Amino acid sequence: SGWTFGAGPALQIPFPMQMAYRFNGIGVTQNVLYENQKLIANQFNSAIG
Amino acid sequence: PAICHDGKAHFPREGVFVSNGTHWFVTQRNFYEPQIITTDNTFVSGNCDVVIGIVNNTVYDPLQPELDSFKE
Amino acid sequence: VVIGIVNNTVYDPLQPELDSFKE
Ligand SMILES: *[C@@H]1O[C@H](CO)[C@@H](O[C@@H]2O[C@H](CO)[C@@H](O)[C@H](O)[C@H]2NC(C)=O)[C@H](O)[C@H]1NC(C)=O
Ligand SMILES: *[C@@H]1O[C@H](CO)[C@@H](O[C@@H]2O[C@H](CO)[C@@H](O)[C@H](O)[C@H]2NC(C)=O)[C@H](O)[C@H]1NC(C)=O
Ligand SMILES: *[C@@H]1O[C@H](CO)[C@@H](O[C@@H]2O[C@H](CO)[C@@H](O)[C@H](O)[C@H]2NC(C)=O)[C@H](O)[C@H]1NC(C)=O
């Protein structure tokens, strides 16, 4: 549910949209993640490994 | 996540796309206020075959009917 | 419905520009 479960009732939301919002938070537009999704996922998995 | 009308992807400027079952609207995140998907609250970038989960729909144009009716 | 609204006109940049040229 992203961060919405802290304020009030939890609200379901697809994960890629959540990551798009979180890039939009730091000043990077949404037209970056929707292209580089595969690379981002690979990097995340490598780091968490 | 995106709408492709003329083979081009359209992303919201600030908000999220929502479909009630028949049409498609763009709404703000923390409150329900649907609006017609024009070309003023969305921006275009990239082709139609790079994003995942895109859908097919047309985007309203405010200038085209107004100026085609008048130019006649 | 808005409490305290006033009356005035809003200029449109496109209307005179595309009305003068269309003649
Ligand atoms: C989803 O929203 C659309 C908005 O266009 C609804 O379509 C309109 O529904 C009203 C209700 O009877 C009609 O009077 C309009 O003529 C419809 N618009 C068009 C273009 O036909 C639609 O009904 C909504 N869907 C649901 C399930 O409520
Ligand atoms: C969205 O519309 C486009 C056309 O503007 C569709 O692209 C073609 O669709 C037909 C039948 O749906 C296929 O036979 C062609 O091979 C498609 N061509 C290309 C270049 O994609 C597209 O399929 C539509 N999207 C959906 C989900 O139906
Ligand atoms: C702003 O202008 C509107 C007209 O476009 C006014 O609405 C009418 O005003 C007349 C007085 O000029 C009244 O007799 C009518 O009853 C009004 N009609 C409606 C539907 O309100 C409006 O009053 C003006 N604003 C103010 C503050 O007077």
Curated annotation (Swiss-Prot), chain A:
Job of this protein:
Subunit of the fusion protein that is processed upon entry into the host cell. Mediates fusion of the virion and cellular membranes by functioning as a class I viral fusion protein. Contains a viral fusion peptide that is unmasked after S2 cleavage. This cleavage can occur at the cell membrane by host TMPRSS2 or during endocytosis by host CSTL. In either case, this triggers an extensive and irreversible conformational change that leads to fusion of the viral envelope with the cellular cytoplasmic membrane, releasing viral genomic RNA into the host cell cytoplasm.
Result for mutant: residue 5 to L: In strain: Eta/B.1.525
Organism this protein belongs to? Severe acute respiratory syndrome coronavirus 2
Q: Under which name does UniProt file this protein? A: Spike protein S2'
